[PDB]
Symmetry: C3
């Protein structure tokens, strides 16, 4: 069952959709201030973030209004009347199967709801840093914290110490790590493009990696398949990606769009 | 010396006292909204929670008003006038030795103070999630966090890595773990009913466990249990440890848990 | 590049400068209420805290007004007008080379800026516990938490498990630990007085320790030199100091000035 997005999940989606975009910096600054315009790159950013958070379902070609409701119930406590308004409006404003999954169709379908509940949506998806302390303390060690690496988070959650050794880790630990890396998707599928990307960035992208274990289509099975193509390489790749999971971006960066993003979120 | 209750200590008391009660879900929903009525199960819930937090002392048969004062000085910063009202009312409203420790006697003694300072008591005992970030950050790694297991917390606190093997752990680590499990009480006594509970839940309950070391310090308790089967002891610790992460599921849609979260989120 | 001071760095400076002072408890109580007076002991405390936070540079004999601005941009979100006022006043009020580094010279240079912006300064340097949750959440595991020991923090930050044995630890881990102990200063220099103090506090002071490795050039160089004077002794000192890094003072203490410090920071 779809759970309310944590700040780890929203930050992952915001940052990854930003870096996958070739849009201008001025456009990306508008996005981190929560007002994407109607240009194609902005429409595709909204579609990307919506899909990554599983708010838009491309198989059914539909927004999932009930997930916006569940997000508001968990994370919007600033205004009971605005909470009830979102509950009443979500289904009528977001209902309907779209003719296609184009960025234009998804953005246009979202537009009325987004305009009507702008400040509520911003807050419930962790856009306002006045809430950041309460949000991370309510979730505690149930969410990966800013600056915490995913392997450490998964080791604690499963009560398992991983020595980067010959031992065979428990399936619950592997599942936690691979889902944090998005090697296994939220739906449980193998994400071979992500695996290949991390192998290549670690310098382990070789021809005898073949399909990167896309054939396996279970966390144990993926781990066993990758380890059989080179155990030392697999440890190296996991370590390399792990370091990059601590800070999705630098909250103290003075480069754009990061500086504008933090300034906006800090002073609402 | 009694220290102001952490959110770990209050959440432990609230949940354990709820799960010990046979009251109806409708009653428990009222309790997690801080609205105990006067039925017997409600009176016993209030007594249970007060005793677990060491606010009511059954050996002396009295509330400890100075402990409510200390809790307010630590965790109530929202209204200076309501803080001073509580400090001046606690002793006159709560002091006095009771004729017995019955649920009715404890609840009735608490009633005027609770009615007069309801919203202050709620907030200073971590009932208002508007404060949850400041409270857990001020305590830091000094308190077990939501979702953290007690063994991890105790390993960090004592700078000890436990390999769950044949090593004999340092006493400060054992004391920390046993007190987190409430195998050793706040007063330092062995809590045999909790040890037995955890052995049975792990499938390691046996007749050779005998008295579960009631005859027995944390080193003494550890040595006594390990002498009855070292592998069983590790299995029991590991099984209870998994249960110390989330005292209840804050995402649960079952009652009373769903009402507990919605109320505390939206004051 | 100088980074905005974390609450770990401000608490370290506040506590160490207090315990270094022989001033009376009545004076120290005024200091923890952000009310230094003009006595020599108070002037010296302000200078000590300013140097420890790298806000005053004794080598160039000047305050660094731009570092106050950077601190305010990071940690003061309560009043745009007071933020802008601080930004405009920092350089005119604080810039200028002093004739000497005396307590009187540093305090007098700081005094007008402080009298003018004291409430904003308090807040941006972590003096108001209404902010404490948001601050530690936004920094996350990138800062040592209250109650956390420095070796643990440094193990997680570098993804290294230290077994306190024969192993040769990675340099990034050594640098993190030594800098947290202030054995290596923020400028990268060996702090021999701090090393000797911790050796003595652990009962490992001895004539063979000689200059306590003040001669060396690098965290690896300092570690190799200390280990060569006695490996077991070095582990014991690290373990002893590590215990003391969890709680810089007892936030539940009823002794002064600790009690008034907590009382003041809680009820602003
Ligand atoms: C570091 O990057 C960001 O902070 C990015 C931000 C704040 C972009 C937020 C995302 C949007 C404005 C896209 C639409 C938003 O309504 C959803 C959650 C689809
Ligand atoms: C998960 O369960 C809860 O949230 C339970 C709650 C909020 C019950 C709180 C306890 C009481 C209303 C009992 C009386 C309370 O005054 C004390 C701290 C004795
Ligand atoms: C535990 O000790 C404290 O709480 C100490 C405090 C609050 C002292 C704060 C420091 C000063 C008043 C010195 C000047 C301050 O302006 C700077 C940051 C130089």
């Amino acid at each position: 069952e779809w759970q309310p997005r944590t700040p780890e999940q929203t930050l992952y989606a915001y940052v990854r959709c930003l870096n996958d975009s070739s849009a201008s910096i001025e456009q990306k600054i508008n996005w981190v201030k929560w007002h994407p315009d109607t240009t194609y790159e902005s429409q595709c950013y909204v579609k990307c973030v919506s899909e990554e958070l599983r708010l838009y379902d491309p198989k059914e070609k539909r927004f999932r209004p009930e997930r916006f409701v569940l997000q508001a119930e968990s994370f919007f406590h600033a205004d009971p009347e605005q909470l009830q308004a979102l509950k009443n409006n979500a289904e009528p404003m977001l209902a309907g199967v779209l003719a296609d999954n184009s960025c234009e169709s998804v953005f246009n379908k979202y537009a009325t709801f987004y305009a009507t509940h702008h400040s509520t949506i911003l807050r419930m998806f962790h856009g306002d840093y006045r809430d950041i302390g309460n949000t991370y303390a309510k979730l505690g060690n149930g969410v990966k914290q800013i600056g915490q690496m995913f392997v450490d988070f998964c080791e604690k959650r499963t009560d398992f110490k991983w020595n980067e050794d010959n031992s065979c880790p428990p399936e619950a630990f592997l599942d936690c790590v691979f889902r944090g890396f998005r090697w296994i998707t939220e739906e449980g599928e193998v994400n071979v493009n992500e695996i290949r990307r991390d192998y290549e960035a670690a310098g382990k992208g070789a021809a005898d990696m073949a399909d990167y274990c896309g054939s396996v289509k279970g966390a144990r099975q993926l781990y066993n398949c990758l380890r059989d193509k080179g155990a030392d390489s697999l440890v190296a790749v996991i370590r390399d990606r792990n370091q990059k999971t601590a800070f999705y971006f630098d909250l103290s960066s003075k480069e754009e769009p990061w500086k504008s993003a933090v300034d906006f979120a800090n002073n609402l």
